[PDB]
Amino acid sequence: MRTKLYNAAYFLLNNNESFGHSFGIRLKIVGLNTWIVGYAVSRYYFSSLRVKAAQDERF
Amino acid sequence: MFKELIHIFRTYYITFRYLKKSNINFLKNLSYTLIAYYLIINFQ
Amino acid sequence: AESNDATSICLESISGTIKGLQKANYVVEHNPNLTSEEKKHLKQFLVYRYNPADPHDQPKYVSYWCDIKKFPPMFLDAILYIKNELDPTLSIRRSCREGICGSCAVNCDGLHTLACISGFNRDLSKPTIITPLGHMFILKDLVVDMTNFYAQYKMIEPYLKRKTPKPDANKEYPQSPEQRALLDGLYECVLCAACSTSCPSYWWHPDRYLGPAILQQAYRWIVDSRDEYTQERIERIAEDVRLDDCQQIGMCSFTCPKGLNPQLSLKNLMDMVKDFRQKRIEQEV
Amino acid sequence: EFYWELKTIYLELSRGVATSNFHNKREVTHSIIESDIKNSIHKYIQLIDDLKDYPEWQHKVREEIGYYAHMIYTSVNHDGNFPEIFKEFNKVDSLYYF
Amino acid sequence: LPIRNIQFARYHYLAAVTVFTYFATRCCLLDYKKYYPLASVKK
Amino acid sequence: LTDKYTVIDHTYDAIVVGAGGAGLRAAFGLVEEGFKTACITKLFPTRSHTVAAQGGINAALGNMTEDDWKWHFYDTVKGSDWLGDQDAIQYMTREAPAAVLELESYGLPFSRTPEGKIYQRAFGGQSLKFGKGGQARRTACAADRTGHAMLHTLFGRSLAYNCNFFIEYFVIDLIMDEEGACRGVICMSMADGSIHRIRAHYTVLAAGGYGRSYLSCTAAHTCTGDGMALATRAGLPLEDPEFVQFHPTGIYGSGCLMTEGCRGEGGILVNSNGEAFMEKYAPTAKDLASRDVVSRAMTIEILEGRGVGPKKDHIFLQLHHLSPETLHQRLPGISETARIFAGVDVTKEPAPVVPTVHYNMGGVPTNWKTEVITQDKNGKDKIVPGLLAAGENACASVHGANRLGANSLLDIVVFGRAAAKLVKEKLKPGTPHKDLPKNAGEQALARLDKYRFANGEYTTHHVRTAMQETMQRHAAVFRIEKLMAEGVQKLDHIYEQSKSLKTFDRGLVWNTDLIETLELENLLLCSKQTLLAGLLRKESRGAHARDDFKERDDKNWMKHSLTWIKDVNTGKTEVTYRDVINHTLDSEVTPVPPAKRSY
């Protein structure tokens, strides 16, 4: 059975002011939360790093 | 807040649709327990 | 006899995606034997064509150059001119011709709307693109599978239910002109689905979330004074994300060719649901 | 749980036809999912029959579970093995979901 | 309808969010090892 | 052989071929009666022509003014021009108040008078006290979109029950056995081309008219008279096909409608001189005269050289006299339609209008219980077993020679309910079926395949356009014998052409080209019958007006004209006659004697 397909609406709709206005707020909140979580993860990651070793050192 | 994160993941990710409301609630309970533990432990 | 095909399918999918991005908006000229001089006098329509019944067919734009001085100025008129004069295999739904049935809803050049009451850019330079409703499965050409829309419409019980017998049976359910005008601008929906196919929440969750049109119909049956199942309907639409998924984008009221305002109806429904949830606690005590 | 079985089948189809699915796009339904659909619909029809003494339960089972059967019906073309796969569904349920 | 000590609940939730964010991000307890090259010296 | 087409067999207690107002009413009425019913339609119910109906539902509720259903009966009889069966008119008129109240009970939103009762407005051809009581306001209208609201309410009620809808199935033919009974129907699923032989006892054949047989017609693109063509191809007769009612007002050059109720609100008809001329043609009711007389007056004024617009081809419908509040409250939809299809702002400009083909008083004959009838070879009429025409497709004679106006929805509802009641009366739910005939659908599949793979010389559109032009030129408001004979010759030639059509799509999924070809065949049959019946009748009655015979002859031509198309391949049309009914169903109302006024 050949599965049916469709043309995604957002690929063929003229850009509108409503999309912009609403997705702007959604992206603002997404950016805020992502920035907070990424800052936490960045602090964790950098603090996880090892200490600098000597030159040509084994173990 | 937690509710909103779950709602966004459900509405945008097709795979996340697999989870029941019961599994979501279990994640909610575990997250609340972990948050309480974090708050308590940081001060110890 | 068959074997695992995860790798072949994956490679084919990636390669096809890349190629389609390179060759997006594939176009085939209906009549290549046209002198570029002639095309100065004719407008170009790019019509989406796809016949899943034929195993060898794939989606594609077809270019038709037509003289716009031979038929009236509407999308449906141009589509039917192309069908009758150029290629009568084109498929589209059409009943009313005056924007009442709502069958001809299509993506008329970037905007979902009824093709029978929508004009097209008269300029001969900019091409016009006619495609089916976006997020609906395509059956053939400009004909989509609106079955799910109707199935959702059925779930709202769109029939007057009354819990109190009529006092005399020789009269009509009383309703003052105010309780009637409360429905004005709300019962004119023709179930064209043009709005709901433009709602992003309906793009993401077609099944769990009822469309703006169906929810507007539920609101119409709720605000109606003659029906007595107000709270029951409110509770029924309050399940999971049948209504909560609406994000008040407002595109529904912008696309509605009938001029209706489903966004306002959904806002009122949300307010009524919130009040219902609160007073299920406040009242019963 | 039976409802979630049907919804799992539908979710697999939807992930198949998702626009973001640039990596696992399949033109023709494979045999395994076809067999799963056929057996799931068979069990659903048997369940509907077993609830003949409870009109409300039968109606709820239809409206709830058969919804995803109808969506699966809409997800695929009417060729190949389609007449045989949806033979039982075409009797009554298909007409209900129109 | 009335909620006993609603204001206390609001402030407790706000305090919990603030404390959790403070400890998770360590927003206030930055690192200045990156600024040392850009700093003057005494003695 | 044609076994290559997949065939699936069903079994139902009753079928309803159509999903208009009549189809839905009959379907859910049958479901109420307890019969396992099915409904077959090529369109989603809410997209049938009933949705486009603007004027109200005509009924004798005494809300706006004192009314008595006997007055409505008299108005209907006079409007029919004494060619409609008295019994059916009596039944419909008597049932109208109950039908409208039941519609309201379903939840149909009607415009409300300040007291809360259903609102009503004047319409063309209404009166009180048997014509001497002045204008009558009995048309209960739901704003200017009554058809839409009525159809949606009926569809909602249908969904309330289980009607086993067959959405977007095209009915090809009727399964009839050698005894003349309608065993069932043979239809095709436009989705995937499956063929279904639905067996059933009774088949309510209500599938609209053939308004699309003309060039300019207000009828929807899907009004191709399939209901009237299935019967014809099955050998049953077609009754009163020559009478075609032209709605007086129709947007010029587009075919869209201007609700007659507008002229009931205070609209005016104006010629180039700038005057209301309908007084000379209807001094008593003025604009609100019978649709036929208004159309004839407009046509005469056009032919008198007083054409209102450029190239003097139409008439001005003035509406800016009314207050803008009234226009926006009672005529919103038509105002918008005028703005769109004419670019004329109704509030301060006059619309262009011209009489346009609107309604088909013809259809499959019935008795009044909605049972198809056919003349036995003796000449006496007999009831066709298991076949119940209803709606516009049924020539129950309730409209006679000229539909009164706003009575079509009333007819739909009343006679759909009547058909359901009759099925309840005769059939029993628990009746086993006998097997279908040996040759269930050989001819249906034969025609389907013949049109599917046709490789003739003329395209479907060319033939359809030729037929429409011929009908427009020769079956216009005024008929004359020489012109009608020329039209008959042209239609015979076009029919000869149709045997060599060309089709460009050989597929099955939504093969709209094949659907349009089949509808073209149906319209050709209907057009041939219509033109011949018009040619034979030598009089000027109702909507059938002839320049050669300007006087109606009750002595000779007070009889329905039945048309037969036997041996479709031959395409030769015969005509016989069936006497009118002058006996009411009861002694409550005395039958109206044939008068000599018709306004």
Ligand SMILES: CCCCCCCCCCCCCCCCCC(=O)OC[C@H](COP(=O)([O-])OCC(O)COP(=O)([O-])OC[C@@H](COC(=O)CCCCCCCCCCCCCCCCC)OC(=O)CCCCCCCCCCCCCCCCC)OC(=O)CCCCCCCCCCCCCCCCC
């Ligand atoms: C598409 C390809 C793209 C490729 C990209 C490749 C990028 C490679 C990056 C490599 C690593 C860079 C690390 C920089 C560290 C900076 C801090 C620092 O120096 O710390 C010193 C660091 C110690 O860190 P620390 O002090 O403990 O804590 C650091 C914290 O950041 C805390 O320090 P802080 O407290 O000072 O923090 C400052 C504060 C500052 O915050 C603020 O105040 C924010 C201010 C923002 C202002 C922005 C203005 C922009 C203007 C816009 C205008 C628009 C106008 C439009 C108009 C339109 C019309 C109207 O917070 C932040 O900086 C916020 C950071 C959190 C980020 C949140 C988002 C995360 C997710 C998203 C990531 C990006 C995705 C992009 C996807 C793109 C897709 C197309 O130690 C060092 O000396 C290390 C130096 C850095 C090198 C590390 C090397 C590690 C190597 C690992 C191996 C693998 C490498 C792989 C490389 C691959 C390459 C391809």
Ligand SMILES: CCCCCCCCCCCCCCCCCC(=O)OC[C@H](COP(=O)([O-])OCC(O)COP(=O)([O-])OC[C@@H](COC(=O)CCCCCCCCCCCCCCCCC)OC(=O)CCCCCCCCCCCCCCCCC)OC(=O)CCCCCCCCCCCCCCCCC
């Ligand atoms: C350094 C520290 C360590 C870092 C690594 C830590 C890893 C921890 C464990 C992570 C476990 C992840 C898996 C479990 C979660 C649920 C997954 C799931 O739904 O399973 C089924 C689902 C598959 O469903 P399906 O039915 O096969 O797909 C069809 C459905 O319609 C699909 O429907 P759908 O909506 O469900 O599918 C969306 C799907 C996404 O899946 C997809 O459908 C597509 C995935 C590939 C997209 C690739 C990009 C496409 C083009 C976009 C434009 C890019 C432009 C770049 C250039 C710009 C130049 C200016 O979303 C997810 O996968 C959800 C979770 C995603 C975030 C967590 C994973 C992060 C992995 C980051 C590393 C990846 C490897 C290295 C890559 C770089 C090497 C140089 O996911 C998978 O099985 C795949 C999992 C992801 C694999 C990696 C793909 C790349 C992702 C990159 C994200 C980068 C974000 C930015 C921050 C990164 C910071 C590190």
Ligand SMILES: CCCCCCCCCCCCCCCCCC(=O)OC[C@H](COP(=O)([O-])OCC(O)COP(=O)([O-])OC[C@@H](COC(=O)CCCCCCCCCCCCCCCCC)OC(=O)CCCCCCCCCCCCCCCCC)OC(=O)CCCCCCCCCCCCCCCCC
């Ligand atoms: C196998 C079993 C199953 C396992 C499943 C897997 C997961 C594990 C499950 C285990 C079961 C327990 C899980 C933890 C509880 C989860 C609760 C939850 O999710 O609730 C959500 C739910 C969320 O609701 P919501 O609507 O979002 O509203 C939340 C708002 O925050 C609204 O909050 P609120 O407004 O209602 O406030 C809450 C209330 C709660 O607080 C209380 O009332 C409790 C107080 C503490 C009691 C602690 C008792 C501990 C006893 C331990 C005994 C030993 C145990 C040893 C066991 C050994 C093993 C046998 O807060 C306060 O009372 C605020 C006090 C503030 C004091 C301020 C001081 C002011 C000083 C200055 C005075 C004035 C000076 C003036 C000077 C003027 C100068 C000018 O929370 C609540 O509503 C309840 C409140 C929150 C309770 C949190 C409790 C956390 C406990 C964690 C214990 C971890 C123990 C680990 C042991 C490990 C051993 C190895």
Ligand SMILES: CCCCCCCCCCCCCCCCCC(=O)OC[C@H](COP(=O)([O-])OCC[N+](C)(C)C)OC(=O)CCCCCCCCCCCCCCCCC
């Ligand atoms: C360490 C690893 C880091 C890697 C970084 C990778 C970054 C990935 C960023 C992804 C952004 C989001 C899109 C993908 C994920 C979508 C998930 C989702 O829910 O979507 C589902 C939906 C699709 O599904 P759907 O529309 O079918 O919705 C589901 C509907 N049902 C359930 C009915 C099936 O949305 C999409 O996937 C939209 C895809 C849009 C793709 C846009 C591509 C833009 C490319 C721009 C290139 C610019 C190049 C410039 C070069 C300049 C040179 C000079």
Ligand SMILES: *Cc1cc2c(cc1C)nc1c(=O)[nH]c(=O)nc-1n2C[C@H](O)[C@H](O)[C@H](O)COP(=O)(O)OP(=O)(O)OC[C@H]1O[C@@H](n2cnc3c(N)ncnc32)[C@H](O)[C@@H]1O
């Ligand atoms: C065209 C028109 C008619 C009209 C009107 C305005 C316009 C523009 N205004 C009216 C008014 O104000 N008052 C009134 O009384 N009548 C008015 N009319 C006329 C009236 O509405 C119609 O005559 C009547 O409503 C039509 O009823 P009916 O149900 O018989 O016709 P239909 O609605 O078109 O129904 C046809 C159904 O059958 C299906 N169909 C058609 N062909 C087939 C085949 N071959 N197989 C299967 N199904 C078929 C159609 O899809 C439809 O469902």
Ligand SMILES: COC1=C(OC)C(=O)C(C/C=C(\C)CC/C=C(\C)CC/C=C(\C)CC/C=C(\C)CC/C=C(\C)CC/C=C(\C)CC/C=C(\C)CCC=C(C)C)=C(C)C1=O
């Ligand atoms: C709110 O409700 C809604 C929805 O939800 C239901 C929707 O789904 C939708 C529709 C949703 C969709 C179409 C979703 C699918 C499409 C998607 C996700 C496409 C969008 C993708 C993204 C936003 C992610 C990719 C973008 C990024 C990672 C951003 C990266 C930004 C960067 C790097 C910043 C670039 C700029 C700079 C560096 C600044 C340079 C200049 C300077 C520094 C200035 C110089 C300064 C000095 C000091 C000199 C709508 C409209 C909606 O309204």
Ligand SMILES: CCCCCCCCCCCCCCCCCC(=O)OC[C@H](COP(=O)(O)OCCN)OC(=O)CCCCCCCCCCCCCCCCC
């Ligand atoms: C938005 C949605 C997604 C969000 C995701 C969020 C994720 C949160 C994760 C939380 C946990 C964080 C853990 C951080 C661990 C970091 C380890 C690391 O790589 O550190 C760098 C390390 C060298 O560091 P160090 O030894 O300290 O030296 C510098 C000292 N001054 O580097 C090394 O030593 C290098 C060797 C180790 C790293 C190997 C990595 C292998 C990756 C294999 C990928 C395979 C898949 C490829 C796919 C594409 C194929 C075409």
Ligand SMILES: CCCCCCCCCCCCCCCCCC(=O)OC[C@H](COP(=O)(O)OCCN)OC(=O)CCCCCCCCCCCCCCCCC
């Ligand atoms: C594709 C990728 C998919 C990824 C999916 C990932 C899903 C992850 C989901 C889990 C993580 C969610 C994190 C949410 C942010 C953290 C918020 C937080 O810290 O609070 C958690 C919760 C309250 O927040 P929330 O429930 O969300 O909102 C309630 C609104 N009324 O707080 C709680 O309920 C915790 C319990 C304590 C609450 C505070 C109690 C009062 C505070 C004072 C306590 C006093 C104790 C005694 C005295 C001590 C001091 C003297």
Ligand code: SF4
């Ligand atoms: S909601 Fe608007 S766009 Fe959708 S069917 Fe109703 S009128 Fe048309």
Ligand code: F3S
């Ligand atoms: S466009 Fe979309 S999500 Fe809500 S209000 Fe309007 S519907």
Ligand code: FES
């Ligand atoms: S063509 Fe009639 S409403 Fe679209």
Ligand SMILES: [Ca+2]
């Ligand atoms: Ca109510």
Ligand SMILES: [Ca+2]
């Ligand atoms: Ca008729």
